[PDB]
Amino acid sequence: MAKSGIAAGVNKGRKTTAKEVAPKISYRKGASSQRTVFVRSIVKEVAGLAPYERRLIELIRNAGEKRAKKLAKKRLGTHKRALRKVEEMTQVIAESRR
Amino acid sequence: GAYKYLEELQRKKQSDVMRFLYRVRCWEYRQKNVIHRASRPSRPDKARRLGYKAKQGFVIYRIRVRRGGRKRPVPKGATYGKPTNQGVNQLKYQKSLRSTAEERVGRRASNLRVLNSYWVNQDSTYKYFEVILVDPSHKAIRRDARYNWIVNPVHKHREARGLTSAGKKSRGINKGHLFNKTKAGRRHTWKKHNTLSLWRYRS
Amino acid sequence: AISKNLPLLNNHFRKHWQERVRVHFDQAGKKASRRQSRLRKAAKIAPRPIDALRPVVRAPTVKYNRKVRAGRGFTLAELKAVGIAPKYARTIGISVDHRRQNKSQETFDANVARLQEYKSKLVIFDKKTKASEVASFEQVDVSATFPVEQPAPESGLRAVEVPEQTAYRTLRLARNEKKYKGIREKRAKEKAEAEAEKAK
Amino acid sequence: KKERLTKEAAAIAEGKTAKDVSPKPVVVKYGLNHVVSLIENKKAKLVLIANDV
Amino acid sequence: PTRLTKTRKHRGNVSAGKGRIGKHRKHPGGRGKAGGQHHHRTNLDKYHPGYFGKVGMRYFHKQQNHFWRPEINLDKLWTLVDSEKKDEYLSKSSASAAPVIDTLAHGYGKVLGKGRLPEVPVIVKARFVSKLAEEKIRAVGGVVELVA
Amino acid sequence: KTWRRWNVKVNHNEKRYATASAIAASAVTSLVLARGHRVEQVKELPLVVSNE
RNA sequence: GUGUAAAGUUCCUUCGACGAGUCGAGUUGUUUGGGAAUGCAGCUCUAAGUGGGUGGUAAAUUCCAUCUAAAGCUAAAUAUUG
RNA sequence: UGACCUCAAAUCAGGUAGGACUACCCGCUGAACUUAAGCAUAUCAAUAAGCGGAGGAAAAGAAACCAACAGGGAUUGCCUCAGUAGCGGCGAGUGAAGCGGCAAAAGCUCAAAUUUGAAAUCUGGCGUCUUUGGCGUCCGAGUUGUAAUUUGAAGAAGGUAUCU
């Protein structure tokens, strides 16, 4: 079925007849909406960039991807957040080249 | 409406606009009394999030609280004990500055109930907080089915007992394995785990 | 301080333990007052039962898989299958749990059958109902009228069918496959990329 | 507004829907949330913003 | 009862059985397990070897439910068959119809192979079996069916 | 101290053993007489009376 | 009872706003059974939107599971040298 | 000649706080005697003393939970887990949690939404009445947002078979 039917190994456990579960609305929490995408784009225009974010952009422009990630981790704290920030600052650069 | 924009803009605290506003307002708040009445929220959206309503009986105080740790107030640094207890500097208060702000504001306006509070601004010497208070004797509060609850006497000085958001944060009142010691009250849990329970028919 | 061939003890009595000694002298008094509270609660709402109908759920952990016990409330899907709204269900003696879901069909079917059994014995009064009909009913105990019942263990006679591979060998092979799955997959991925990259 | 409501209450006595007796209002929109939502829906023809908020 | 204790018999004798030289004192030798490496070494070395030191690796957050696996041997396996029907089963069991013994439903995780089975086919349902337990079950014409 | 032991556990089977033994002893005339009961004018033990 | 009212129930479509000097990170002190760091607090840094937290060994890569923080109320079972 | 914002004054109209008690309760602050046969980490003890705040209970509470199961399902307490995992000059010592049985069980509320064809909301004064309040009216609060509507278990806006 879905489990191997035995008590050891890969995918161990008792076989049961699966029943499809209606997803909970709480699991939609990370999803984006038209309302928040719109509001965040205008606030970006009004607010602008942070001092460390301008510093990140210069490092990316000067081909310092390795340098920018080390800065973005030092600022944001974690490597996972630093990766997303560097990707976001490259997209900002990609939108300034037209 | 505009509250969503207000929310998204206050998260850009390092933008030029917000930095300018923080400079100006920090100077202005520093020029007033340590505790003073705010004619209105400086962050209406943040006040709304925390239960504030633009009604009669809702009050805002701004307060200014000194930053840093808690120096041990022993004379000349002499602790008179074992070397593990000789620290005087690098010691920390177990409550947040937000809680101190709430308690001092609640002490000043002793006829009101501290509803909640929020951070407004900051410098090297002070943090600035705005405290949302509710008047329990005002009929606009007493006849409000959503705010009658704070009129009942179990909410007398809830900020002094750690029952606000900041107080419950500092008490460790959260669910899960990371809060085993403080989930239901640290001292209650300790007393429960250090009580000898003896029954009539001993097992 | 340590003398003779005796077990080494851990008697945690170095604090002010005598200030926190709870002796349950009131066990019988609490039993009696608990019974009186229970009678008062029952007599207040008779003939409506004092207990809400509870579901039957599997106990968690590899140690209590076999057992089945009373849950907290019926899931929204289970009540949906019998056509009862949760807001309405809470007012006719049925407990609801918005947190539990039904990944599998067995517990779902057990609880749907349980809800349908309770629903067949339900009689909901109204304004037209007179006290003569209400007095015709006795306050039942729902926890006993719809008990949680363990599925019977399999027993009796069945045909013997012997696979070629022993059960012990099957368990050993399952353990070995689980133990080396990651390294074998890494080895296979490296082998495939090597023999399909230079074979370009 | 009190006079308009009095007229509409007179009209509901006659059996009418009270929407025919009162014309559709053409007025100034105010309120920050209301006006922001109007702008976001491309319904505002002109917005006057105070300079001393 | 206090009337049966030797405290009642020591009344009238000066030292209450503690000696005139030794003089029962507060805590000679220390409190608890004091001096286990210094002056109580002769006791702990003789009676509790292995007391001091570390052995093995730690296990942060050990949940004992993972390791639940009660054992049942083969000489105790037929006690799980219904008592009122054991004697009929011991006679009429064959390859076509043998009793089913659900060991997990009786609270057992592994079937071990100590003892001897009746020379009677059985169907044993287990989470785990030992090599010899399953060899003995197959020899009487039975089978082990793995469950979870 | 109040946390002295006051109640004592007895095995249920042993308690029932003793109850049965006492019921059996109630039918022995010598035991009932040594027990102090003025039963010399009862013709036989056990003494059973009608349900009225 | 002013019940052409209020609420629920089936199905389809388009949507579905969800709390920031906060989360998180470093360091310092204290505390915890929490051990490359359990909670709390100070200071420095400081977010995101299928994102965020947790999954008791630090790290990167790939998955999976499970909830939905930074806002709030709520009887009973529990405590009780006043 | 008048608004607004901010800030004042009044023996202004009407309210509210303080202090007491100590057994239990919510926090802060915080030892040392003592044990380690000495002693400094440790222990006593996250205790005593000190400070702030309540109630008939308090607190906690409807998962940013537990788990790793065939999954449980707010909080609390008891029995057990368990003197266990772990922590500890790994010494003296110390030390929980999940599951399981039970007592008791009860669920929910905001913020973020344009009422926009009508601030529909509310304190107060005055009058009146059948007065823990209703009705009328007038100032005021409030659009820098008071009502109705929704709270993630959802739900909204359109359409929808009609029923309860």
Tab-separated table of C-alpha atoms (C1' of nucleotides) in Angstrom, chain C residues 10-16 19-20 24 34 38 41 54 57-62 64-66 69-72 76 87 90 96-101 103-104 107, chain H residues 32 35 43-48 62-63 67-74 78-79 83-84 92-95 98-101 103-109 153-154:
chain	number	residue	atom	x	y	z
C	10	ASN	CA	19.855	8.137	45.597
C	11	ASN	CA	17.704	9.712	48.314
C	12	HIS	CA	17.061	13.299	47.158
C	13	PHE	CA	16.352	14.841	50.560
C	14	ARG	CA	18.993	17.568	50.841
C	15	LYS	CA	16.644	20.523	50.301
C	16	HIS	CA	13.990	21.809	52.712
C	19	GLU	CA	8.109	22.283	53.819
C	20	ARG	CA	6.675	20.630	50.675
C	24	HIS	CA	-3.455	13.060	50.922
C	34	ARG	CA	-16.363	14.558	43.570
C	38	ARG	CA	-21.076	14.591	39.599
C	41	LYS	CA	-24.074	18.118	37.319
C	54	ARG	CA	-15.956	10.874	21.949
C	57	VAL	CA	-8.348	6.840	17.858
C	58	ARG	CA	-5.096	4.921	17.566
C	59	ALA	CA	-2.637	5.510	20.423
C	60	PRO	CA	0.668	6.969	19.079
C	61	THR	CA	4.215	5.403	19.199
C	62	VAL	CA	5.431	1.938	18.135
C	64	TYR	CA	0.892	1.651	21.628
C	65	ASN	CA	0.023	1.115	17.943
C	66	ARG	CA	-1.921	-2.007	18.889
C	69	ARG	CA	-8.604	4.557	22.795
C	70	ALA	CA	-11.033	7.450	23.084
C	71	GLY	CA	-9.958	10.580	21.231
C	72	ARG	CA	-10.842	14.172	21.938
C	76	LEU	CA	-14.598	17.838	10.518
C	87	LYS	CA	-21.309	24.211	15.489
C	90	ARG	CA	-21.350	20.707	19.756
C	96	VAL	CA	-15.407	18.092	17.693
C	97	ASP	CA	-11.666	18.220	17.019
C	98	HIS	CA	-10.537	20.640	14.315
C	99	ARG	CA	-6.930	19.490	14.789
C	100	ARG	CA	-7.225	15.779	13.982
C	101	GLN	CA	-7.383	14.565	10.382
C	103	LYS	CA	-5.003	10.032	6.641
C	104	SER	CA	-6.386	6.483	6.602
C	107	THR	CA	-10.333	5.159	11.890
H	32	A	C1'	25.234	32.253	53.407
H	35	U	C1'	27.420	18.925	51.813
H	43	U	C1'	25.656	21.877	46.583
H	44	C	C1'	22.281	24.109	49.893
H	45	A	C1'	19.066	26.856	45.907
H	46	A	C1'	16.992	29.156	40.743
H	47	U	C1'	15.730	28.373	48.648
H	48	A	C1'	15.572	32.254	53.277
H	62	A	C1'	-7.591	26.361	22.553
H	63	A	C1'	-0.565	24.541	19.246
H	67	A	C1'	5.588	13.027	17.627
H	68	A	C1'	8.129	9.750	13.775
H	69	C	C1'	3.093	6.051	15.072
H	70	A	C1'	-1.653	2.300	11.847
H	71	G	C1'	-0.230	8.728	14.539
H	72	G	C1'	-2.142	11.954	18.692
H	73	G	C1'	-4.638	16.814	19.541
H	74	A	C1'	-6.196	23.708	24.381
H	78	C	C1'	-2.937	12.723	39.945
H	79	C	C1'	-0.586	7.661	39.042
H	83	G	C1'	15.803	8.364	40.577
H	84	U	C1'	15.322	7.287	34.174
H	92	A	C1'	29.659	15.018	46.218
H	93	G	C1'	25.351	15.309	43.956
H	94	U	C1'	21.370	16.246	40.711
H	95	G	C1'	17.407	15.387	37.034
H	98	G	C1'	6.889	12.288	25.065
H	99	C	C1'	3.768	8.103	25.222
H	100	G	C1'	-0.023	5.200	28.793
H	101	G	C1'	-4.370	5.030	32.859
H	103	A	C1'	-9.917	13.566	37.421
H	104	A	C1'	-12.144	17.581	34.680
H	105	A	C1'	-13.520	18.969	30.033
H	106	A	C1'	-15.404	24.336	26.347
H	107	G	C1'	-14.652	27.082	23.431
H	108	C	C1'	-13.124	31.326	21.061
H	109	U	C1'	-11.833	37.233	20.011
H	153	A	C1'	-10.989	25.005	12.007
H	154	A	C1'	-11.371	29.276	7.857
